[PDB]
Design a protein around this ligand. Structure first.
Ligand SMILES: COc1ccc(CN)cc1
Ligand SMILES: COc1ccc(CN)cc1
Lengths: 110, 358, 122, 358
């Protein structure tokens, strides 16, 4: 279920799910480096009926995973609301900015 | 008997040429610009643009500018962000201009990589992730100014009625105007009143740009305008793109470079889809609507062929649309656009097409 | 004699992998990439070296030596990809072999597209 | 929840396979995809820039890549290199400099190998003059250019000696190179002519035993080279075809198109009917299983359009690869049994390799 773009935590992912790339929803595949920064999503949990803040930390320094590409735009906003925006590379500040995959880490309730 | 030769120029006249920025997202370190003849769909050439290239054509039509990122060993080693100048006819590299290592890495919105109306400065978006606008002096071949005044803002809207002024959209819902000196540093700036509610009616960043004013569309199908006929920007809106029948089906805009203005007629073109709701703002066009900006009323609607981005040629009265891979050419000399042809497989993953200036 | 000049033929004919002189092409036809059968696309550089084919011309019934010069220094054109192997041989007959990059000795070895240059009668 | 890195491949080494994806459409972004052959799970990858080659260290601890960089990819200085990567962490460790003549080409096993003792990497060069390069792994140094191998092609290591290998030469024979302690050439020998280059050219891919190698030809004949002794002894041809096979024009086809199951002496070959000039790289209509001792075909099964294979001796497994999909076969019995298919393992791969276990 977490490999589906319809998985509720993936509501503002524009990228490849790391869980399809040898990582997991919350871990980078081997040899890919977590981004310290990210855009954040507000996604509705269908189980408990609540909305949660999800941090979309990219994994960086390897070329594109190419698996489970998702493009979901729930509550996503343009670059003038920069940390809600997913059309930029959140690997941008990494030692190496090459984009590999995206993680979907639950932060808390919205 | 025969010998292979190089050194050749693009076969088709400049007036026939369009530039399809293929991000090649699946292999984003090998992005490139595909050059096409829009009259017959012929592939004319390409310019390689490494990781997440951006592209524009010099206002004078002689040069192609690209912006990209390299590393010594691609996935490791030292980063070099650069603007490149390439010859438009030979499609050959001429020079590299160093940028600080914070040029925006992101999808090919027009407003991330632009130039002043006079062509003398390249104006680009930075994000480190703090935002600033970078200024590159074309004559010097040097980066000459970082506009930190634009922190918290996004994208570059050149003002077509001034040589070296542009606007950006800020997170207060207003516009910041920057007026450059002849050295490319900031001579003056001003901030508009709030144009739009960032929380309640966020706008798309893509302007529908006229000589002395810009129109923007919102997530909910409203239209806002910034008038820069004078030194201070005057803002207004919203008016709705939607009539009462449109409201039943929840029509809303969607796309990336999703709007355009035909300046002579005042006709604004917008990608639209029904069944609008939270999260549908990048959905492909079910339709293209054509709005008279003066009467604030739709004058036409045609099927959108799943387009996501567009561009307009003022002189030839043309609109191009792009679904990610295919380019459609429309004659827009009349209110209802007429489809002329489609160029299939122009790109793998392109959200930006541009005419060669003529 | 008309079949010896690709410039006179139908663009659809010469852009096809089955065009007679493309018989040992493994790559993208430069003619689909903004070049022609015998000219590199703008800003790509001819390879000084090549593998060579012998191709039958059904139109005049003679066999010809075709030199498969690549155009180099730009990324993959991606169009009209052909993989034909008539009379092609492994790397121990190196100049008959098309599974290596014939841009290998260029200033920039990035492979862009492949031309089919008529050397003459076999 | 907090995002962590530093992880190793999640599956045991014994389950790992390596699909070398050339990504020919975007050849500057080649990479190695690492899969679990037991369940088809994607485990990770290693980027390999332009036309990467890969092998795993004999000891299973490292991944070795060979690739080419340029300072600005399509321009600037060339750097040909071997890289050493940790097999479990899939992280870059070390770059070893090569002269700028490493082979650029399709991923035949024989262009990038290592000595039995694992101390030297042995690689094919082409300038376009061919030589073989020796790289001292320990020292991280290129140590020897074997120009004596000029006019030959590919590296066939000898599993019965620590630092010896053969190459196939344009005289239809084999050249044996025997390395000294330092990686320089100690001795060498040339075999008699094994095959007729003009009349019965062989595929370069060996069906490799512990002290013998068999080769298939364009016309379906089999040749052998024996290196149990001091000097190589050559034989053949014998035909893979019976009378019915000949009348249907069955011939071999593919790239890494053969394999040997050593315990049984079974040779696996990709075959297709209606063979003629120019079909030597056609996908397999069938896989044929030949008894090399009796010289008879003992099985034939659907080829699933495969082009390359590899064998695991200890688990009795054959993998086949059609360019994008990997098929796993149980080959413990004469007739292979298909266990599974991994769809979309690569975009353009002609080489798959098992992680070494013995
Ligand atoms: C650099 O272009 C890119 C790259 C990555 C992503 C993913 N958030 C979006 C745009
Ligand atoms: C560098 O690998 C390559 C590149 C190009 C070609 C095409 N002859 C074959 C192999």
């Amino acid at each position: 279920e977490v490999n589906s773009c319809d998985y509720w935590r993936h509501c503002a992912v524009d990228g490849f799910l790391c869980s399809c790339c040898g990582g997991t929803t919350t871990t980078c595949p081997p040899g890919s480096t977590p981004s310290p920064i990210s855009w954040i999503g507000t996604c509705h949990n269908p189980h408990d009926g609540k909305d949660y803040l999800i941090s979309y930390h990219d994994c960086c320094g390897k070329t594109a995973c190419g698996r489970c590409q998702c493009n979901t735009q729930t509550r996503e906003r343009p670059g003038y609301e920069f940390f809600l925006h997913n059309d930029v590379n959140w690997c941008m500040a990494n030692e190496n900015s090459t984009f590999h995959c995206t993680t979907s880490v639950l932060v808390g309730l919205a | 008997r025969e010998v292979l030769t190089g050194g050749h120029s693009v076969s088709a006249p400049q007036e026939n040429r369009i530039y399809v920025m293929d991000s090649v997202f699946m292999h984003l370190t090998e992005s490139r610009v595909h050059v096409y003849d829009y009259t017959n769909g012929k592939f004319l050439g390409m310019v390689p643009t490494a990781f997440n290239g951006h592209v524009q054509v010099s206002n004078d039509g002689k040069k192609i500018y690209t912006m990209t990122t390299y590393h010594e060993r691609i996935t490791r080693g030292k980063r070099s962000d650069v603007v490149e100048v390439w010859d438009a006819d030979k499609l050959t590299f001429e020079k590299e201009i160093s940028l600080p290592p914070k040029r925006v890495q992101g999808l090919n919105y027009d407003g991330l990589f632009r130039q002043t109306t006079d062509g003398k400065f390249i104006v680009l978006q930075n994000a480190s992730p703090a935002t600033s606008i970078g200024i590159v002096d074309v004559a010097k071949g040097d980066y000459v100014e970082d506009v930190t005044a634009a922190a918290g803002c996004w994208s570059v809207i050149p003002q077509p009625n001034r040589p070296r002024s542009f606007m950006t959209i800020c997170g207060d819902g207003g516009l910041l105007t920057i007026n450059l000196g002849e050295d490319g540093k900031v001579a003056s700036q001003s901030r508009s009143k709030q144009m739009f509610s960032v929380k309640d009616d966020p706008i798309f960043i893509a302007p529908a740009l006229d000589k002395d004013k810009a129109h923007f569309v919102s997530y909910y199908g409203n239209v806002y305008s910034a008038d820069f006929s004078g030194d201070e920007v005057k803002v207004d809106g919203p008016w709705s793109l939607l009539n009462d029948e449109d409201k039943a089906k929840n029509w809303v805009p969607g796309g990336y470079n999703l709007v355009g203005l035909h300046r002579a007629s005042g006709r604004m073109y917008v990608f639209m889809h029904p069944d609008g709701k939270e999260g549908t703002h990048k959905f492909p066009a079910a339709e293209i609507w054509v709005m008279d900006t003066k009467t604030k009323q739709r004058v036409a609607r045609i099927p959108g062929r799943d387009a996501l981005s567009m561009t307009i040629d003022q002189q030839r009265n043309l609109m191009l649309t792009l679904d990610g891979g295919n380019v459609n050419v429309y004659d827009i000399s009349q209110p209802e656009p007429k489809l002329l042809r489609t160029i299939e497989g122009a790109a793998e993953a392109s959200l930006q097409v541009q005419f060669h200036p003529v």
